[PDB]
Design a protein around this ligand. Structure first.
Ligand SMILES: CC(=O)N[C@H]1[C@H](O[C@@H]2[C@H](O)[C@@H](O)[C@H](O[C@H]3[C@H](O)[C@@H](O)[C@H](O)O[C@@H]3CO)O[C@@H]2CO)O[C@H](CO)[C@H](O)[C@@H]1O
Length: 581
């Protein structure tokens, strides 16, 4: 024909290079299991031949159960997956530059060049007041050059249990946001920073974060704290100045507006002790603190070594001032001072200083850190850090070091997460299989942590919608959402399949934690299922990017994700049965 069509997996990308392989698909039916308030995703893959094809459109019926309960077609959003270019290597500028369908772009029609793949993401939101049962419906695909329409048989079962709202779970999610990057992309001026004109491009993507379970909000407290690793500079949200007497003063304006925005959006609730403010960092890159010297009237920097007399002096000034400031705002209880991977000497100097500065109630700042922990059961220092996150590449699957460490922390009421970054596999890159994200989240629970941290909400390059290639890291590493087009009406961001799979993983670990809690009798059955998870092997492509070791390892990430999900849905059904009989 002029146009071919088939249901396809959301687990991996359908790429142009796989054209000839893809044209041989003909999957016409789809079924899945969801809870009330849950979501489901699917995909239809289309193709063209010698001739191009205009105005390709897809559309969805209403969905109806056996009691004629309705889920409107408006809960089904079908979006073209837009392709963007990606250098497939890591700091390898001569690596091949290939298209990946990494963007959940727009609804409506689309043209398709000769001999091309195009795919459309399908997202189904089950309303929070939906009735249980088996729902059926269909999705149609048509075009202009086609005098016919293809048809696709979709059903799904809603189980009689309500997907927990994020605030009803104990899942920890922290994605680092870069609000100045949002300002740069959308040409927000210096003077409009953290005003309503800025907030308009932040609210949507922050709501999105909140709704998938985000609780951590990063705030920079010194300038360029990651040495400009990213496309955009990282300004400090707290401006430092040295006055004529030679003591430091701090301007909290940006920090205050940023945090207040996050309080207004419900990510943070400092009165109720919810959410975290992560202050980056007491160990910024090379210990460098840049400041305006009012005396010499110029910009200067210092680089004092942790533990040194100058260091203790300066951070004592900041921490003391910051604590008082946060106490007047009522924010102090949810505030953490962040560290990062440093020498044990630097880390101990930090924890020792921080612990030594207290308010009237002898409360000190909480402390948060990426740590490299991989073995041994000496927790005495690690327990003085209130939130830690461990890179997946430092977690040894052939041991229970990580899980034992995490379990100790849960007992003491401390937070623990894992993260992925450059060099990790599974991970959440543009070139990753999106299923890897669901796996990652399940791995956080397999390790008995509270959840997942990633550095990379929104660190856009110049024009990521067209090319995400950046000089460091696997492509797409620095962002899980895309921006909208600069002229958008409109939308302020687009989601990605990789992010939707993180979201799936999170909802699905939330189902498992909910069951464990509400059906104590199923708990060890569930725990055993979780603890059966296998870990695929990390390989590396010809150009420096981490990837799956082999086809077997790709398949395992998918099979394992689905296995566990299904297992949990069966436990779901067991609990539901119990209630009915
Ligand atoms: C939490 C997070 O994602 N942080 C980084 C992330 O960095 C990874 C890890 O957290 C770092 O400790 C490590 O940093 C350096 C390492 O400790 C040094 O011994 C070595 O000489 O240089 C390392 C820098 O490569 O780096 C790893 C990643 O390689 O990585 C992401 C990029 O995906 C961002 O840089 C986050 O800021």
């Amino acid at each position: 024909t002029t146009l071919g069509a088939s249901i396809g997996s959301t687990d991996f990308h359908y790429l142009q290079k796989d054209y000839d392989e893809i044209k041989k698909l003909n999957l016409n039916t789809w079924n899945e299991v969801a809870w009330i308030g849950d979501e489901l995703n699917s995909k239809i893959v289309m193709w063209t031949n010698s001739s191009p094809v205009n105005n390709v459109t897809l559309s969805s019926s209403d969905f109806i159960n056996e009691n004629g309960d309705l889920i409107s077609s408006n809960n089904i959003k079908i979006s073209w997956l837009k392709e963007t270019l990606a250098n497939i290597g890591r700091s390898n500028p001569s690596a091949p530059l290939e298209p990946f369908p990494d963007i959940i772009h727009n609804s409506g029609s689309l043209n398709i060049e000769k001999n091309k793949i195009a795919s459309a993401w399908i997202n189904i939101k089950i309303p929070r007041n939906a009735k249980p049962g088996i729902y059926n419906g269909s999705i149609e695909v048509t075009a202009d050059e086609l005098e016919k329409s293809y048809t696709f048989d979709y059903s799904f079962e809603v189980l009689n249990l309500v997907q927990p709202l994020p605030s009803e779970t104990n899942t920890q999610i922290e994605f680092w946001q870069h609000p100045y990057t949002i300002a740069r992309y959308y040409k927000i001026c210096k003077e409009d920073l953290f005003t309503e004109k800025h907030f308009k491009y932040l609210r949507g993507n922050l709501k999105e974060y909140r709704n998938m379970g985000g609780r951590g909000v990063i705030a920079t407290i010194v300038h360029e704290a990651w040495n400009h690793q990213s496309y955009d500079s990282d300004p400090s949200m707290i401006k430092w100045r040295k006055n004529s007497y030679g003591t430091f003063e701090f301007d909290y304006s940006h920090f205050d507006k940023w945090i207040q925005l996050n309080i207004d959006l419900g990510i943070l609730d400092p009165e109720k002790g919810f959410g975290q403010i992560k202050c980056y960092s007491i160990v910024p890159w090379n210990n460098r603190i840049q400041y305006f010297n009012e005396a010499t009237n110029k910009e200067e920097a210092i680089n004092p070594t942790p533990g040194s007399d100058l260091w203790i002096n300066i951070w004592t000034q900041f921490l003391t001032s910051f604590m008082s400031h946060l106490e007047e705002k009522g924010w102090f209880n949810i505030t953490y001072i962040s560290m990062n991977q440093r020498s044990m000497d630097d880390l101990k100097a930090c924890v020792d200083l921080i612990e030594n500065i207290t308010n009237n109630s002898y409360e000190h700042f909480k402390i948060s850190s990426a740590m490299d922990y991989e073995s041994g059961n000496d927790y005495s220092f690690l327990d003085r850090i209130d939130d830690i996150s461990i890179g997946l590449s430092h977690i040894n699957h052939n041991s229970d070091d990580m899980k034992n460490m995490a379990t100790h922390r849960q007992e003491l009421g401390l937070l623990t997460t894992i993260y992925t970054c450059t060099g990790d596999y599974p991970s959440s890159f543009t070139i990753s299989d999106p299923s890897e994200g669901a796996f990652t989240i399940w791995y956080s629970l397999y390790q008995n942590t509270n959840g997942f941290l990633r550095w990379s909400w929104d660190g856009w390059v110049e024009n990521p919608l067209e090319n995400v290639s950046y000089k460091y890291w696997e492509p797409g590493d620095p962002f899980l959402i895309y921006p909208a087009e600069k002229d958008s009406i409109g939308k302020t961001f687009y989601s990605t399949p990789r992010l939707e799979k993180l979201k799936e993983g999170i909802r699905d670990i939330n189902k498992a934690k909910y069951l464990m809690e509400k059906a104590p009798n199923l708990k060890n059955s569930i725990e055993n299922l979780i603890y059966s998870l296998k870990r695929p092997n990390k390989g590396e492509n010809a150009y420096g990017s981490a990837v799956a070791a082999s086809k077997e390892d790709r398949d395992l990430t998918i099979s394992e994700a689905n296995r566990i999900k299904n297992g949990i849905n069966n436990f779901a059904r067991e609990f539901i049965s119990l209630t009915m009989e």
